[PDB]
Amino acid sequence: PTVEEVD
Amino acid sequence: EPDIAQLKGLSPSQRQAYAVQLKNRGNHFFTAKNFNEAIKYYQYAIELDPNEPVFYSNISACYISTGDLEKVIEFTTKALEIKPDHSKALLRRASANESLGNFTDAMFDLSVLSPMLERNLNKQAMKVLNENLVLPSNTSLASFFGIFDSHLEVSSVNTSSNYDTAYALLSDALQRLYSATDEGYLVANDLLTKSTDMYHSLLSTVDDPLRENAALALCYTGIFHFLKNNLLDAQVLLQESINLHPTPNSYIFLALTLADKENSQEFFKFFQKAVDLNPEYPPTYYHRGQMYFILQDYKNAKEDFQKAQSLNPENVYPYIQLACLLYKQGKFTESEAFFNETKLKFPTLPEVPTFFAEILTDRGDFDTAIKQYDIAKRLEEVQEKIHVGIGPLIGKATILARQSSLDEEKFNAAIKLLTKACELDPRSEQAKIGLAQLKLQMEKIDEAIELFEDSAILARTMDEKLQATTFAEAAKIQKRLRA
Ligand SMILES: [Cl-]
Ligand SMILES: [Cl-]
Ligand SMILES: [Cl-]
Ligand SMILES: [Cl-]
Ligand SMILES: [Cl-]
Ligand SMILES: [Cl-]
Ligand SMILES: [Cl-]
Ligand SMILES: [Cl-]
Ligand SMILES: [Cl-]
Ligand SMILES: [Cl-]
Ligand SMILES: [Cl-]
Ligand code: NA
Ligand code: NA
Ligand code: NA
Q: Tell me the three-class secondary structure of chain B, residue by residue.
A: CCCHHHHHCCCHHHHHHHHHHHHHHHHHHHHCCCHHHHHHHHHHHHCCCCCCHHHHHHHHHHHHCCCCHHHHHHHHHHHHHHCCCCHHHHHHHHHHHHHCCCHHHHHHHHHHHCCHHHHHHHHHHHHHHHHHCCCCCHHHHHHHHCCCCHHHHHHCCCCCCCCCCCHHHHHHHHHHHHCCCHHHHHHHHHHHHHHHHHHHHHHCCCCHHHHHHHHHHHHHHHHHHHHHCCHHHHHHHHHHHHHHCCCHHHHHHHHHHCCCCCCCHHHHHHHHHHHHHCCCCHHHHHHHHHHHHHCCCHHHHHHHHHHHHHHCCCCHHHHHHHHHHHHHCCCHHHHHHHHHHHHHHCCCCCHHHHHHHHHHHHCCCHHHHHHHHHHHHHHHHHCCCCCCCCHHHHHHHHHHHHHCCCCHHHHHHHHHHHHHHHHHCCCCHHHHHHHHHHHHHCCCHHHHHHHHHHHHHHCCCHHHHHHHHHHHHHHHHHHHHHC
**What is the distance in angstroms between the Cα of A3 and the nearest Cα belonging to chain B?**
6
Q: Which of A3, A4, A6 sits opposite B27 (nearest CB)?
A: A6
Q: Which of B58, B64, B95 sits opposite A7 (nearest CB)?
A: B58
CB neighbour list of residue B40: distance below 8 Å, 6 or more residues apart: B26
Residues with CB under 5 A from ligand 4 (ion): B 158-159, 161, 164, 167, 209
Interface of A with B (CB under 8 A): 3-7
| Cβ contact B205:B158 at 8 Å | no
CA of B223 to the centre of ligand 6 (A): 8
How many interchain CB pairs under 8 A, A with B?
21
Task: Tell me how far apart the alpha carbons of residues B235 and B465 are, in angstroms, rounded to a whole number.
Answer: 23
CB neighbour list of residue B68: distance below 8 Å, 6 or more residues apart: none
* Nearest CA-CA partner of B144 in B256, B2, B241: B256
Task: Tell me how far apart the alpha carbons of residues B76 and B53 are, in angstroms, rounded to a whole number.
Answer: 9
In a 13 Å sphere around the CA of B178, the CA atoms on its Cβ side amount to 16
Instruction: Please state, in angstroms and as integers, the Cα–Cα distance from residue B262 to each residue in B258, B267, B268, B271, B287, following that order.
Output: 12, 11, 13, 17, 19
Task: Tell me how far apart the alpha carbons of residues B147 and B321 are, in angstroms, rounded to a whole number.
Answer: 12
**What is the distance in angstroms between the Cα of B124 and the nearest Cα belonging to chain A?**
24
Residues of B in contact with A5 (CB under 8 A): 61
Task: Tell me how far apart the alpha carbons of residues B296 and B329 are, in angstroms, rounded to a whole number.
Answer: 10
- CA B336-B341-B346 angle, to 5 degrees, is 115
Residues with CB under 5 A from ligand 3 (ion): B 102, 104-105
Task: Tell me how far apart the alpha carbons of residues B328 and B348 are, in angstroms, rounded to a whole number.
Answer: 25
* Nearest CA-CA partner of B177 in B386, B354, B411, B21: B386
Interface of B with A (CB under 8 A): 26-27, 30-31, 38, 54, 57-58, 61, 64, 88, 91-92, 95
Buried b (16+ CB within 10 A) or exposed e, B285-294: bbbbbbbbbe
| Cβ contact B130:B174 at 8 Å | no
**What is the distance in angstroms between the Cα of A6 and the nearest Cα belonging to chain B?**
5
* Nearest CA-CA partner of B278 in B245, B303, B306: B245
- CA B139-B140-B145 angle, to 5 degrees, is 105
Distance linking the first and last C-alpha atoms of chain A = 8
* Nearest CA-CA partner of B65 in B39, B91, B44: B39
Residue of B nearest to A1 (CA): B88
CA of B448 to the centre of ligand 14 (A): 18
* Nearest CA-CA partner of B343 in B355, B331, B332, B333: B355
Task: Tell me how far apart the alpha carbons of residues B451 and B445 are, in angstroms, rounded to a whole number.
Answer: 10
Task: Judge: B57–A7 Cβ closer than 8 Å, yes or no.
Answer: yes
Phi-psi region of B270 (alpha: psi -120 to 50; beta: other; left: phi over 0): alpha
| Cβ contact B354:B362 at 8 Å | no
* Nearest CA-CA partner of B373 in B389, B363, B385, B384: B389
Residues of B in contact with A6 (CB under 8 A): 26-27, 30-31, 38, 57-58, 61
Task: Judge: B95–A3 Cβ closer than 8 Å, yes or no.
Answer: yes
Task: Tell me how far apart the alpha carbons of residues B206 and B198 are, in angstroms, rounded to a whole number.
Answer: 13
| Cβ contact B399:B410 at 8 Å | no
- CA B377-B380-B383 angle, to 5 degrees, is 155
> Around Cβ B466, how many Cβ atoms within 10 Å?
17
Query: How many residues are present in chain A?
Result: 7
Query: Which of B400-405's residues contact partners 24+ apart within 8 Å by CB, and which partners?
Result: B400/B370, B401/B434, B401/B437, B401/B438, B403/B366
Task: Tell me how far apart the alpha carbons of residues B93 and B99 are, in angstroms, rounded to a whole number.
Answer: 10
* Nearest CA-CA partner of B440 in B459, B422, B427, B453: B453
| Cβ contact B480:B124 at 8 Å | no
DSSP 8-state assignment for residue A1: -
Task: Tell me how far apart the alpha carbons of residues B446 and B478 are, in angstroms, rounded to a whole number.
Answer: 11
Backbone φ and ψ for B11, nearest 5 degrees, come out as -55, 165
Task: Tell me how far apart the alpha carbons of residues B418 and B37 are, in angstroms, rounded to a whole number.
Answer: 63
Mutation target to probe the B interface, by most B beta carbons within 10 A, among A2, A4, A6, A7 is: A6
Residues of A in contact with B57 (CB under 8 A): 6-7
- Which ligand is nearest to the Cα of residue B233, counting in written order? 6
CB neighbour list of residue B370: distance below 8 Å, 6 or more residues apart: B357, B396, B399, B400
| Cβ contact B27:A6 at 8 Å | yes
Task: Tell me how far apart the alpha carbons of residues B42 and B39 are, in angstroms, rounded to a whole number.
Answer: 5
Task: Tell me how far apart the alpha carbons of residues B430 and B30 are, in angstroms, rounded to a whole number.
Answer: 55
CA of B224 to the centre of ligand 6 (A): 5
> Around Cβ B129, how many Cβ atoms within 10 Å?
17
Task: Tell me how far apart the alpha carbons of residues B453 and B127 are, in angstroms, rounded to a whole number.
Answer: 14
Resolution of this PDB entry, in A? 2.1
Residues of A in contact with B31 (CB under 8 A): 6
Task: Tell me how far apart the alpha carbons of residues B325 and B322 are, in angstroms, rounded to a whole number.
Answer: 5
CA of B106 to the centre of ligand 1 (A): 12
CB neighbour list of residue B329: distance below 8 Å, 6 or more residues apart: B298
Query: How many residues are present in chain B?
Result: 483
